[PDB]
């Protein structure tokens, strides 16, 4: 159960706080898990997806083991746009198809100044909770 | 149109009850709004009788009611010069001063004086400063208590 009044739990109110959330927040929402290799290496469960991050489809029509790189992110349609993830239209003009973060797994994070410090700070929070539970 | 045995009934709904109806779905949230005051006030005035100041034994008025007794408003004035308490001091010492009571009898005077005499004796005057002089009750009679009196100070039972 939730408890804290000063949080919602309302079929509608957080259905709403979806396709009205600003791009600020949608980052956090549009997060996908990391593959076991990284999840081991780094002590972080899931990350916000980013433009040039390498990704494996896990669910969907065209699930597979092919590591495609992300191309862009509709944070508006609120859905990502990957590499050989694509379909041929009537004219031959290939169009990519939408997939969530949530239905995808990160196989190689594209690292940075700003993204490293998150990976540190998430892994530091994880271990602080386990050291606090200890 | 009445039919065969009832009362008359002058129910008074010819005006406009409808507009000015108060329903009470505050009642329980109010209960709690209140709780938090009782609560907060006590934690704020930490060592001090939570209920409020000391208040006098007093007789109910009209003829039926005679035999009862109450917490009155405040102890009289005549009452204090007798107990040896200055009226403006009493107000700081958690002693409730009405200054508006005609004291008519020695019975209910001394009865009510004994409450002050009683109060003095079981009162720990917590001293102005920590390094303070006279009349404040000693660091033993000081350590022993942090005790708020829950419920009405020296409750008046008939």
């Amino acid at each position: 159960m939730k408890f804290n009044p000063f949080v919602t739990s309302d079929r509608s109110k957080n259905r709403k706080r979806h396709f009205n959330a600003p791009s600020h927040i949608r980052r956090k929402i549009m997060s996908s898990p990391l593959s076991k290799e990284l999840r081991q290496k780094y002590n972080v469960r899931s990350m916000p997806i980013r433009k040039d991050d390498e990704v494996q489809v896990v669910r969907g029509h065209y699930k597979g083991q092919q590591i495609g790189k992300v191309v862009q992110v509709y944070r508006k349609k609120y859905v990502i746009y990957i590499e050989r993830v694509q379909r041929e239209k009537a004219n031959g003009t290939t169009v990519h198809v939408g997939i969530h973060p949530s239905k995808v797994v990160i196989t190689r994070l594209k690292l940075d100044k700003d993204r490293k410090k998150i990976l540190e700070r998430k892994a530091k929070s994880r271990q602080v909770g386990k050291e606090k539970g200890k | 149109a009445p039919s065969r045995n009832g009362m008359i009934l002058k129910p008074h709904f010819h005006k406009d009850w409808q507009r000015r109806v108060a329903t009470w779905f505050n009642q329980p949230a109010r209960k709690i709004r209140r709780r938090k005051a009782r609560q907060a006030k006590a934690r704020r005035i930490a060592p001090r009788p939570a209920s409020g100041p000391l208040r006098p034994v007093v007789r109910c008025p009209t003829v039926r009611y005679h035999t009862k007794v109450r917490a009155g408003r405040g102890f009289s004035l005549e009452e204090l010069r007798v107990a040896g308490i200055h009226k403006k001091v009493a107000r700081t010492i958690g002693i409730s001063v009405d200054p508006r009571r005609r004291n008519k009898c020695t019975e209910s005077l001394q009865a009510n004086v004994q409450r002050l005499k009683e109060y003095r004796s079981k009162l720990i005057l917590f001293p102005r400063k920590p390094s303070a002089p006279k009349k404040g009750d000693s660091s033993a009679e000081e350590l022993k208590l942090a005790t708020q009196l829950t419920g009405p100070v020296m409750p008046i039972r008939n």
Binding site: M1, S9, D10, R11, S12 | V21, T23
Partner: protein
């Protein structure tokens, strides 16, 4: 709302105009102009007797009534007949007024709790709850009341010393203090007899809570258990005592198909 369909300013052009004598909306080059307003019968408009706020929503019971409602719920928390007959999956349970050590008030982790509910063979009620999880039939779905499930065993404890934390995530379990029992939760649906788990600490406190019988409650002001209307509740024993059987006219059970007249 008090204003429901009642914000219109419609006169009613009554009689001489065919129409219908409703109050019909004024002027306009809209469509909503000569429609009808303030009829229960009409669009916009409003209902019978606007559901008002000062309906007597809540209700009332005598203390005594609702103390010996708890009695009757508790008394039938024994008697595996009634408890089972709520689908309370008590078959491998050792005994029915199921008392447990007072170590239990002090578990602080759901894994401990769960290991208790195995070792008292009481999974299979929670198990059962745990299968009965579905989407509610109706319109409640789109109102914060989508899922539903069974009730699981009630668990009772004189003092939260960490316990209520432990038995929380486990679906179906409700905790109740002994000092603060509740008829809604012991006897859900107004049916009798839920599976309960007294912890010794609590189980002692039941007679002091609300009485033995030739002794006061000594925790409620004045309260003693209800007397029975009759003691020997089984009558089948009664009906074949020799006292009774001796003093009875002999039967009449030829039966007696009616006679066709010739």
């Amino acid at each position: 709302s008090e204003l429901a369909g009642h914000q219109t300013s419609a006169e009613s052009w009554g009689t001489g105009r065919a129409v219908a004598r409703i109050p019909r909306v004024r002027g306009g080059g809209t469509h909503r102009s000569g429609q009808g307003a303030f009829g229960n019968m009409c669009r916009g408009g409003r209902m019978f007797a606007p559901t008002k706020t000062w309906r007597r929503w809540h209700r009332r019971v005598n203390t005594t009534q609702k103390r010996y409602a708890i009695c009757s719920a508790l008394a039938a928390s024994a008697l595996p007949a009634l408890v089972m007959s709520k689908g309370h999956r008590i078959e491998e349970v050792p005994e029915l007024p199921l008392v447990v050590e007072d170590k239990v008030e002090s578990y602080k982790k759901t894994k401990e709790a769960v290991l208790l509910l195995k070792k008292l063979k009481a999974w299979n009620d929670i198990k059962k709850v745990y299968a009965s999880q579905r989407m509610r039939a109706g319109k409640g779905k789109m109102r914060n009341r989508r899922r539903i499930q069974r009730r699981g065993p009630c668990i009772i404890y004189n003092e939260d010393n960490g316990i209520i934390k432990a038995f929380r995530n486990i679906p179906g379990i409700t905790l109740l203090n002994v000092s603060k029992l509740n008829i809604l939760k012991l006897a859900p649906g107004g049916h009798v007899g839920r599976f309960c788990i007294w912890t010794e600490s609590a189980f002692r406190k039941l007679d002091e809570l609300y009485g033995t019988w030739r002794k006061a409650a000594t925790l409620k002001s004045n309260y003693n258990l209800p007397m029975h209307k009759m003691l020997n509740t089984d009558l089948s024993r009664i009906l074949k005592s020799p006292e009774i059987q001796r003093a009875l006219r002999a039967p009449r059970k030829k039966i007696h198909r009616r006679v066709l007249k010739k």
